[PDB]
Amino acid sequence: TTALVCDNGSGLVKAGFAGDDAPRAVFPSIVGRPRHQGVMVGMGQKDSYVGDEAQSKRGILTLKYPIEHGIITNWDDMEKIWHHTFYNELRVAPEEHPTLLTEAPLNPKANREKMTQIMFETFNVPAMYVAIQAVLSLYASGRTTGIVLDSGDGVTHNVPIYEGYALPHAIMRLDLAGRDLTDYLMKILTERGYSFVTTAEREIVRDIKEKLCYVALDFENEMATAASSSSLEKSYELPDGQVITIGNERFRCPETLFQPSFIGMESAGIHETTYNSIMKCDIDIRKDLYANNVLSGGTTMYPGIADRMQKEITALAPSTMKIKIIAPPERKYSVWIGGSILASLSTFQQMWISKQEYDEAGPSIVHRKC
Amino acid sequence: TTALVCDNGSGLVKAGFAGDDAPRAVFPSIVGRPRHQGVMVGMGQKDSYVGDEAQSKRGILTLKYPIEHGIITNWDDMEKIWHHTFYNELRVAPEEHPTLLTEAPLNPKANREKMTQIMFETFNVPAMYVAIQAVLSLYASGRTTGIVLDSGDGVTHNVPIYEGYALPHAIMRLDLAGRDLTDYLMKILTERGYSFVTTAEREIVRDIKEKLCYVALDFENEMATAASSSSLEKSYELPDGQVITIGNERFRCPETLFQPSFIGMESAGIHETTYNSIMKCDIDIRKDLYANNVLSGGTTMYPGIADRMQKEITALAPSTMKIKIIAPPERKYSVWIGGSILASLSTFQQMWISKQEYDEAGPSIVHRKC
Amino acid sequence: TTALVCDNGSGLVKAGFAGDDAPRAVFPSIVGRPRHQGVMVGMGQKDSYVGDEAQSKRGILTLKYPIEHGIITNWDDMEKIWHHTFYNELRVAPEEHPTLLTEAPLNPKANREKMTQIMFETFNVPAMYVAIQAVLSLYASGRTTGIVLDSGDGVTHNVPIYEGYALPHAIMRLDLAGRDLTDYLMKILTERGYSFVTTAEREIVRDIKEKLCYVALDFENEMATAASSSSLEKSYELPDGQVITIGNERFRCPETLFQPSFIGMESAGIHETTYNSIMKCDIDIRKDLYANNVLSGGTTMYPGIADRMQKEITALAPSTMKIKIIAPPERKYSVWIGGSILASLSTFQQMWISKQEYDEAGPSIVHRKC
Amino acid sequence: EKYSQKEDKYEEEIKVLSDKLKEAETRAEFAERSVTKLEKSIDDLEDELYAQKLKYKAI
Amino acid sequence: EKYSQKEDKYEEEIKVLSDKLKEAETRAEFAERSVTKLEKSIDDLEDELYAQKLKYKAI
Ligand SMILES: Nc1ncnc2c1ncn2[C@@H]1O[C@H](COP(=O)(O)OP(=O)(O)O)[C@@H](O)[C@H]1O
């Protein structure tokens, strides 16, 4: 029987069937609840909307993401989202499909334990499994060696792999991603007069970020140029008219990935954490790591991020080794694509956590062997 | 058992049975008392006349409205009017029918408390309910989303609704309506020589207003045109002969709705308060509010009011939105029509305020739950 | 040569000389223009009245605040107010005094640019400077560490300071203040019968708010108590007689600061935003932030606001740290007091923006270095 | 009117004094609950230290 | 007359509530020093218990 792949992430649910080429369902990981009164007797008021139905009733709801930084912090809402994904989007019975869930590295054990307990109890899946997003991204890239930088909506992390062997001591997890860039942009837009405070307005600002922002190859003279002329200004149109124009914000927003001090964080930029995770590996494999930087996730989709990353890592690394940033055009779905590939492998069909194994060993089976 | 709908209003009582298409009884909400002597012994002098009986004998009576600005300010007269409505117009027994009264938003609590106390005590209705006029108007318009501008005889108010959710912080209530226009016309007709000071003469002027007045699309050039030629002059015949002719008064009277400074008020015109109530709503729903302006009430019946409204709001809103003024031809009875629809819904039969709930909770039950 | 301190604010201008203990001039930041006709030939009709002269001719004027939410939205009226402040209230020549203006954090750049351009051009100040109201409030409190809560007439904002270092990523700005409470009270008073719609009537309602309103320690049982007895009712006398009495409105008005949903806002109460701004700072300084909550501004003057704030933050924070709310008895002028202390410092005399620097760098010098 | 304003300042003092009275009463009750908690905790600590003393003197 | 009697009632409420605030704050601070010494006792108990754990892990 076929299996399900359910890459959760903190900003977008991506589900589908093991074997396909792309996720069948892609919708926001949002649960909305009404704020206002409700006066039309007989309108049939739902209690809560999920997915992109909550995105269309956006104006009257207060939206909540049940996953904050890769960690599930509201389990009822996560159960609602999974129920939606299984029944309304994929239209299957979870009792007839092994499920391949996905998780970021270096996050609490209770996350996986509760995940597998929820699956086996309130969905009665025949089997399940929890992979690491970076490994699946490597599968999708068609490699067995490289340092993959995954940057979604909640968490950025590097995982260096060599010949299919992981270097767990060199895994470096950073905690700024798309959502912190959205918040920084909401803050920077105030200095032009635009004010976005609501959750719905946060979605509007996320769309502005996805449409107008880009990474500057050289931040300082780009700033000077934006101050000199006005050729960098684009115009966006809110969903009530009200055209707005932004200038240097376009590249001041994603620059936070390379200077996390803009949001008051002490960490280093993604280029420097990548270089550090490389230099934490054995001296023999880093020459091959330098040439297999695999970008993944949505936050790595800005125009000009590959060139800036290559420039920075080249300036850091020795002047001989060949830096090579691999950025596929569909890198936003690499985790799901690799998950489908993995779940389709014949030799993988022994790694599932059968229901009987759980019935014996409790929820703690998940990190014991799998 | 069928239910009654009793849209009260401050200038006209519209009553009927829940399920009909139009109110069964429509008469003025007025109470007259004789002022003169009375000499013919045995003529059978009544103490007071109500409804449109007081309208035909108005030559010898002094007329009084028991509702000033949506607020009932004479509870004995209002009890007389309700007694008339039940026994002489509808010819039913109030002890056998739930009654759906109606009220304007943002008016004192004692109004609804006294309404329900009067009903339950001096009429012994089995149950009752007090709705909001704008919600019922939206029911009758066949929508669940829109900003409805209701304008009757006493009060003008906007209520924005979205997907059946009210935005009670954006409700705006204005206190000029048909009656203030009637008074302004009584004051403007003096500058041609005609003098109406009596209450009966106020009724005559109300009829002049309902027959000869219209809203000018462009006030200034219309003024200049009326000054240039004399093609705008119509003639009216009072009920004793004495033809009168009015000129620019025809459009100077309803223009007060768009320039409330003419009667010395500080507010903004109905177009501007509509735009403000829209701009007080969440940025996502106002594009759908812009295209569902639902006019209601008698004061919105002037010829050319929809076009002036659309011109003004279009000039105020962004140049991309589609402003649509929805003005049905029967918009004078939308509140009653919607009230009948509402009282006919099967899911509504649990929202009544039963006699027993009142007996347990006092008159405060009305707003406390319902 | 002495310097001037000109804390503008959206509701009250407070000006004076650097070095005093209290502002010399405190008047409403308002500009009135006559509505009505004007008949007595020779009365010397002024075009517009400013300050508290517009407050005594209030009955015939239409008042306008030139500052909406900390942002100057009418630059001609703001220039009128500044001209008044300099010449008729302080009675000085602006060409002989550096000027210390004040601004709220996180508001557009054009505000400060236009402010400094106005000063240097149409007043020819020798130098100027634009401070942040929270820093000055801390100066006046006699501290170098704390999280202030400044809440004036237009904007409420927290700024956490430690050892004289600001945490700009933890600054949280909120947009409900005295004016939104005044409007909410104007709305809540209608449900008891009283109707205030004019701008003058808004001033009357502001005075009612300043005299009769307080913050309930526990909102729910306070509500139940006001419903049970009638010992919470006070009486107020409008300036024509006409005594009015209010009950639970007294504490329902300022409760909006703790439940901003009453006016249809999605934000959190001031206690929750204070706690969030604390929890956004480094784990080492927040124990010292918990014990230095500095209240400032007029809107923090309600009776019982410090007690409610302490109760709420205590319920939110861990059960070991000591919550101290520092509410001085003169907290309404802390920004001005701190501004005078700052402008009087010897080591500050190098931070002024001399006129020559502006002549060289344009109005952009302001946020460039100062 | 002088009597009026004196009565007003009086009722102002009354209101603020009663507010701080209720706050302080809740504070006192919470402090007493805290005393109870500390008695319980010192009891548990005594028990555990005594058990460890028993074992140590035994060995 | 009503102002005189209302001001007298306000005065007696002032006095009673003032003395009550006095006694309440005193009993509060005294119970709080009690709390303080109980916390210090918790500290001493935990330290001596740690010492006994040390002796047990040694022998
Ligand atoms: N074209 C784009 N350009 C820049 N950023 C994008 C783009 N598309 C998505 N993003 C960012 O990526 C985030 C979603 O990425 P995704 O890979 O779905 O994260 P997750 O896997 O955690 O759901 C969004 O928050 C958005 O800010």
Ligand SMILES: Nc1ncnc2c1ncn2[C@@H]1O[C@H](COP(=O)(O)OP(=O)(O)O)[C@@H](O)[C@H]1O
């Ligand atoms: N055809 C018309 N043209 C202009 N005004 C009208 C017309 N018909 C009624 N009116 C005005 O509408 C008012 C009555 O409207 P209505 O909706 O019945 O008010 P209410 O709901 O308060 O009873 C009258 O005061 C009258 O001036």
Ligand SMILES: Nc1ncnc2c1ncn2[C@@H]1O[C@H](COP(=O)(O)OP(=O)(O)O)[C@@H](O)[C@H]1O
């Ligand atoms: N004693 C008081 N009690 C409650 N509110 C007050 C009091 N005094 C002033 N206010 C409110 O504070 C506002 C003015 O505060 P202020 O600090 O002057 O604002 P700004 O700093 O913006 O000028 C007014 O809108 C008023 O509603």
